Design a binder for this molecule. Structure first.
Ligand SMILES: [Zn+2]
Ligand SMILES: [Zn+2]
Ligand SMILES: [Zn+2]
Ligand SMILES: [Zn+2]
Lengths: 145, 94, 68, 277, 48, 48, 98, 248, 148, 193
RNA sequence: AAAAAAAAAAAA
């Protein structure tokens, strides 16, 4: 609602923000409209952080509705914290964040190579999400000021 | 000096003008009083009953008539229907 | 706009028709004010201005008959 | 007595969006956007209620509180609360005067008017004149205007510029003028029309100009006469010959041929030399 | 003091002035206006 | 010029159409003296 | 009034565009003198004196413009100000005695 | 750090609880942000939070209370005082010139630079010397009721510009219920339309073709209601003379 | 725990809960109905009044079932206070001298008013004017002084 | 009706990063079906800040995630075919789900929990999967949840449950020339161990 | 002993 109010106060009502925090033009934009509607790194960074938060919250909502069970919830949370560069365009507005992405990838490798040993076959199912969740909390600690 | 009594006692010479205030409407100065003094004087002016000499028993009597003018408070152990608890949201009859 | 000016009795429709006729008359006067207009062009502009004035007069007559 | 009558039922009174004049509803400005600008202001619709003072008046939860303003929506005929409204639901009387910062409904008055001259109004003109137009042009305009522009207050002067369908109603009270403007806007007189009751500008007629200038002058004179003592002002005009004789005899103070100046004689204070006050 | 006509001595007042509680979330309320520069101080005599 | 002749022509034909050139970001030079700097008084009285 | 507003707008835009050229102030003040707006012309000349305090030509033209409209006491105050500000310019003293 | 508020805007309680907000609003004259002082009026438990509506500099320029915006010497509106006393109004009222003058003069306005008294006496003296074939007298047929029962209007001629509509309305309210009263001071004409013919008959009976309202002589007749249009100055003058001739 | 447990990790309530369970669901359904009450006709602050009223009513039901009638056990009372069936701080004020009929906690938060006052509904009715039907902007209280 | 809120609402955008972090730091663990958190909320509805710090007992947190490691490995071995959830979970044009009409009293599914033995895991059995374990017992300082003390059977049980994620290194001599000082020394000499 | 926006696509 804050992002929508900021869009509507600036009279950019030809931009639609959908509920997964994607900003798309509803029509074909002129040069003047494209120059007026070009948001900056603060708006877009905040939008992408809200998108990641929405993905996490929506995973918990899908668990609470009954559509997915707890193992699917944990695997989805671990997938989401490991695929911020794929599920968000968050890196486009703060590129040092790539470090965090790399960190999660490194953790994933270690976790995955200790998780699939013996009868535990490959595929989805690893819900050990705590290290990547830590990494993005420390990212938020840095990014708040 | 110039705070002694003989300095404050002497007047200003000369005649008086036949034809000052800090702000445009009057004179206002910063003052220091206790919070309780301002609250008590504001209460004495504000409360309808500031003054009018009255002891505890007839004040309780006035409270009793005021309470019986109001609606029934209800029973708090009755959760539904007539007799349900209304409480401080009971209005005064008029 | 409707062809039957006298049949129009609505005040807002007559006012809108009169405003459109006035805008057309102003556009015709602005076109006639252009020096590029030749004798045929000036005659066409004068005829358009006269037609717009007649339409505005009919709309105003209908308005004065039925509100305005 | 009589409680305030609920005008419109709450089932018909909601808080919904305006009719769709665009593609996207702007929620910051609460206005439709998109479409074409040929729509723009479009037209002024017909309002959802009129007022009967003899039928809709009563008491609210405002007669108990001194200083309560009148109700805008009771003046608009669409107030559903009735006796539970926090504002007055009666007609403004002649003693219902207000300061030059608010109207009779409590809305703040502005420095200057708006170009589309309506709204609350400005405090830089004590405007008791309401401009009504969009009247169905007939021959009996004056009678129906005097019948229907009469239940809102006490009226000084209605000049009906007939043929144009325009009238200028001047009430004796500014609060009554504001009440009439907020009550008759988008109403019907005899046929289905939308009245454009707006704030009147200034009558260029020099007779009206000198009337307004004079009325301003005796209003200020009334204020000055309230300020000054009765003997002082009675000497000030000097229409009474006895007051003139009192001025000649009193403004001597021993020295003959003085005729003391008005700064010295008409002076108020503890140290003045006069009966003072 | 005395004002608006009447000259009766009104009782003196004790006024409690408290800062108003402001919403912590409220942005700055008013825009900044670019007003042109005022005239300088009156220039001195030229003592050549 | 053409606006002037069309305004005069419509002025002759009864109606008084209001002319407005009040763009946004525009100052009013006819309301009051723009940035009024009154002359400094001297030893000579100039009220007459 | 439309002509007056357009001329005032043009003159003020020239003044805002280049205030360090005396011709803009001179033209605006002379034009406002022509419609007998003496307070406006005085304000324009005093604003020019705020931009150009020690210009002898501006002082001379403003004293002359005050004199040619028979404002004697205004112009004598102006000459007092001019010989106060620039006591070493003999042109102002010579005009003042003349 | 303290507002300039008159006594009638202040609460009746001698002890005032006041809120203060730095840059709480823009001044209603110069549109500059200013410290707003606010208090609760004597209308306890509902009403309006009274506040300083204009800044202190504009209150020095206008000599007015910050809340009510009326003159602090006579209790008059600022424009009423200025029109009736011909005052200078010391300050520009344009858009940018307001901030320019306030930016360049806020230290001299505070010290009372940049007292009417005598001009009030001048206004009082000026209002002391204020200076604001004839038809036969009416015969019996003017106030006798006509045979047509549909005739309802009462025509009044001789109305001056000083007579308001309300004086006529409550002068004729004592005779019955008035459906309509049209007073045109431009043409000195008036039409009274009652609801019952008995009231109009009583008005004709106890008026007898003549009337005096607030010292103004008027002539009353029976009339079928006809409109008043664009009408000649000579005809207006002759029925004004006729209305004066109602009292010979 | 106020946090929901599925079915097999839920612990049963203490004994005597099933006697008052119907009235507890009456209060719960009253609050759920108070969630869906139109705000279109009333001021914004008036939209929140029934929730404070129902919270007061449910807390008062628990409070006078334990302290006046003593029809519920102490363990059941602490379980009701711990599981959100009654407001423990409002009950704590109700056991004090002078706050026995207090409408809600926010009406005695003196640090959060303009002039460090309580609410006007805390005032005894005798010191208020006649025909003054005050109605608290916090909760709609019409006077909650103990003498009232 | 809410125009008077709008500016304030937009201003709280300035403080939405803390809220996100606060929410993201107080997310329920896989062994909790639901969690209650304390929130500080604006009275106009513009900003909800989770007013909690997720304090845990570190041996308990280690044992709980070790039991998670066991349970997810066993389930990924036992399940016929693990179906990954779809990201994003909801469509872009689907409106946000109301709490009252969609989640509020809905039966939660059972969370990931290792089935403890009633006799072997007797020291932790009744409190192992609580949100704040032993908060009402004298094993903690109080409801502010800041200090813990545990008995020998409890610490033994927590250590046994932590063996997937606990170090087996006892000798510090294991870390000869593989510690922070040697890494910094090798960084100074531009060499790699 | 193992490194992943802008220029630049133009004022009824
Ligand atoms: Zn005042
Ligand atoms: Zn309360
Ligand atoms: Zn309260
Ligand atoms: Zn209360």
């Amino acid at each position: 609602n804050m992002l929508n109010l900021l869009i509507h106060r600036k009279n950019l009502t030809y931009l639609h923000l959908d509920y997964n925090f994607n900003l798309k033009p509803v029509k074909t934009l002129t040069t003047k409209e494209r120059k007026k509607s070009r948001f900056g790194n603060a708006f877009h960074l905040m939008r992408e952080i809200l998108r990641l938060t929405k993905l996490i919250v929506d995973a918990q909502v899908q668990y609470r509705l009954g559509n997915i069970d707890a193992f699917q919830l944990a695997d989805g949370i671990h997938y989401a914290f490991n695929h911020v560069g794929q599920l968000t365009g968050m890196y486009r507005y703060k590129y040092k964040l790539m470090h965090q992405i790399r960190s999660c990838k490194d953790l994933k490798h270690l976790i995955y190579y200790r998780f699939n040993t013996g009868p535990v076959g490959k595929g989805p199912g690893c819900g050990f999400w705590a290290p990547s969740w830590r990494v993005w909390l420390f990212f938020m600690r840095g990014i708040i000021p | 000096v110039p705070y002694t009594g003989e300095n404050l006692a002497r007047p200003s010479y000369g005649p008086a003008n036949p034809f000052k205030n800090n702000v445009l409407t009057g004179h206002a100065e910063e003052m220091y009083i206790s919070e309780a003094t301002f609250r008590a004087k504001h209460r004495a002016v504000e409360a309808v009953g500031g003054g009018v000499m009255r002891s505890n028993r007839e004040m309780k009597e006035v409270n009793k008539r005021l309470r019986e003018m109001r609606e029934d408070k209800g029973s708090a152990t009755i959760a539904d229907g007539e007799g349900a608890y209304i409480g401080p949201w009971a209005r005064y009859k008029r | 706009r409707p062809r039957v000016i006298t049949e129009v009795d609505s005040i807002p429709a007559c006012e809108k028709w009169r405003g459109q006729v006035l805008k057309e008359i102003s556009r015709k006067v602005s076109r006639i004010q252009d020096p590029a207009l030749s004798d045929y062009q000036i005659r066409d502009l004068n005829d358009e201005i006269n037609k717009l004035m007649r339409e505005k007069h009919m709309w105003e007559v209908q308005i004065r008959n039925l509100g305005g | 007595r009589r409680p305030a009558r609920p005008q419109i039922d709450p089932a018909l009174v909601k808080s919904e969006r305006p009719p769709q004049t665009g593609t996207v509803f702007n929620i910051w400005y609460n206005k439709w956007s998109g479409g074409d600008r040929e729509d723009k202001y479009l037209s002024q619709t017909h309002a959802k209620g009129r007022c009967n003072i003899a039928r809709d008046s009563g008491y609210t939860r405002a007669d108990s509180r001194p200083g309560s303003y009148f109700c805008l929506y009771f003046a608009r005929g669409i107030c559903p609360k009735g006796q539970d409204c926090d504002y007055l639901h009666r007609l403004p009387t002649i003693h219902d005067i207000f300061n030059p910062n608010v109207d009779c409904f409590g809305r703040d008055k502005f420095a200057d008017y708006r170009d589309d001259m309506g709204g609350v109004g400005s405090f830089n003109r004590q405007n008791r004149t309401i401009y009504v137009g969009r009247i169905h042009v007939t021959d009996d305009i004056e009678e129906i205007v005097a019948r229907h522009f009469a239940e809102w207050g006490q009226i000084e002067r209605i000049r009906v510029l007939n043929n144009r369908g325009v009238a200028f109603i001047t009430y004796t009270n500014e609060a009554n003028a504001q009440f009439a403007k907020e009550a008759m806007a988008h109403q019907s007189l005899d046929h289905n029309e939308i009245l454009n009751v707006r704030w009147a500008t200034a009558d260029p007629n020099p007779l009206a100009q000198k009337r307004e200038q004079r009325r301003i002058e005796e209003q200020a004179a009334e204020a000055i006469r309230r300020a000054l003592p009765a003997e002082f002002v009675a000497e000030i005009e000097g229409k009474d010959p006895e007051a003139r004789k009192r001025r000649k005899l009193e403004s001597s103070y021993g020295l003959e041929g003085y005729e003391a100046p008005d700064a010295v004689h008409f002076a108020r204070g503890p140290n003045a030399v006069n009966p003072r006050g | 003091s005395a004002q608006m006509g009447n000259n009766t001595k009104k009782q003196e007042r004790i006024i409690k002035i408290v800062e108003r509680q402001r919403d912590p979330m409220e942005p700055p309320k008013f825009k900044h206006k670019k007003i042109p520069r005022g005239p300088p101080s009156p220039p001195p005599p030229v003592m050549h | 010029l053409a606006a002037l002749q069309k305004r005069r022509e419509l002025k002759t034909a009864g109606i008084n159409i209001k002319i407005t050139t009040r763009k946004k970001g525009q100052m009013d030079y006819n309301a009051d003296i723009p940035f009024e700097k009154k002359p400094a008084p001297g030893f000579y009285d100039t009220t007459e | 009034k439309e002509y007056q507003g357009r001329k005032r707008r043009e003159f003020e835009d020239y003044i805002r565009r280049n205030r360090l050229r005396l011709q803009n102030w001179f033209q605006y003040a002379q034009w406002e003198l022509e419609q007998k707006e003496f307070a406006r012309a005085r304000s324009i000349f005093e604003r020019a004196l705020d931009v150009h305090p020690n210009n002898t030509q501006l002082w001379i033209r403003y004293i002359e413009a005050e004199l040619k409209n028979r404002n004697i006491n205004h112009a004598r105050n102006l000459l007092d100000r001019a010989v106060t500000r620039l006591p070493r310019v003999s042109k102002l003293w010579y005009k003042y005695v003349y | 750090d303290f507002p300039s508020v008159c006594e009638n805007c202040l609460p009746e309680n001698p002890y005032v609880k006041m809120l203060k907000e730095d840059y709480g609003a823009e001044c209603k004259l110069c549109t500059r942000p200013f410290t707003v002082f606010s208090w609760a009026g004597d209308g306890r438990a509902h009403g309006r939070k009274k506040r300083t509506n204009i800044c202190l500099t504009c209150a020095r320029l206008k000599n007015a209370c910050q809340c009510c915006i009326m003159d602090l010497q006579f209790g008059l509106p600022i424009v009423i005082r200025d029109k009736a006393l011909e005052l200078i109004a010391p300050g520009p009222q344009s858009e940018i010139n307001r901030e320019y003058f306030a930016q360049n003069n806020e230290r001299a306005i505070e010290e009372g630079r940049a007292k009417t008294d005598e001009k009030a006496r001048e206004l009082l003296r000026r209002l002391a010397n204020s200076k604001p074939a004839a038809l036969p007298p009416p015969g019996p047929k003017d106030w006798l009721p006509p045979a047509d029962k549909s005739i309802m209007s009462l025509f009044i001629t001789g109305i001056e510009d000083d007579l308001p509509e309300w004086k006529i309305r409550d002068f004729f309210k004592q005779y019955g219920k008035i459906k309509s009263l049209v007073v045109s001071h431009m043409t000195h004409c008036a039409f009274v339309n009652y609801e019952t013919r008995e009231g109009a008959e009583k008005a004709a009976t106890e008026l007898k073709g003549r009337a005096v309202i607030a010292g103004c002589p008027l002539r009353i007749r029976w009339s079928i209601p006809r409109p008043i249009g664009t009408m000649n100055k000579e005809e207006r003058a002759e029925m004004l003379r006729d209305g004066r001739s109602a009292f010979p | 725990m106020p946090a929901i447990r599925p079915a097999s990790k839920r612990k049963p309530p203490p004994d005597g809960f099933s006697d008052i369970e119907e009235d507890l669901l009456i209060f719960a359904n009253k609050m759920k109905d108070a969630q869906n009450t139109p705000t279109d006709n009333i001021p914004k602050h008036q939209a929140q009044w029934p929730i404070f009223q129902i919270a007061h009513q449910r807390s008062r039901y628990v409070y006078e079932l334990y302290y006046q009638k003593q029809a519920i056990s102490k363990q059941l009372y602490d379980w009701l206070l711990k599981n959100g069936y009654a407001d423990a701080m409002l009950i704590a004020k109700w056991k004090k001298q002078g706050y026995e009929k207090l409408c809600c906690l926010r009406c005695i938060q003196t640090k959060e008013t303009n002039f460090n006052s309580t609410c006007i509904c805390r005032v005894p009715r005798a010191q208020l004017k006649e025909d003054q039907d005050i109605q608290c902007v916090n909760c709609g209280c019409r006077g909650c002084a103990s003498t009232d | 009706k809410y125009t008077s809120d709008k500016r304030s609402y937009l201003g709280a955008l300035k403080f939405m990063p803390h809220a996100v972090l606060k929410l993201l730091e107080n997310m329920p663990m896989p062994w909790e079906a639901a969690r209650e958190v304390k929130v500080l909320y604006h009275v106009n509805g513009c900003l909800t800040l989770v007013n909690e710090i997720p304090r845990v007992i570190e041996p308990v947190f280690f044992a709980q995630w070790g039991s998670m490691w066991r349970t997810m490995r066993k389930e990924k071995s036992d399940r016929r075919l693990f179906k990954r959830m779809r990201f994003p979970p909801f469509d872009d044009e689907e409106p946000p789900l109301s709490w009252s009409e969609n989640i509020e009293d809905v039966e939660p599914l059972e969370p990931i929990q290792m089935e403890l033995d009633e006799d072997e895991d007797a020291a932790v059995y009744e409190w192992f999967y609580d949100h704040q374990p032993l908060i009402d017992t004298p094993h903690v300082n109080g409801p502010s949840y800041k200090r813990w003390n545990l008995t020998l059977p409890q610490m033994a049980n927590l250590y046994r449950l932590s063996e997937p994620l606990v170090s087996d290194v006892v000798d510090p001599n294991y870390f000869y020339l593989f510690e922070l000082k040697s890494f910094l020394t090798a960084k100074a000499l531009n060499v790699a161990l």
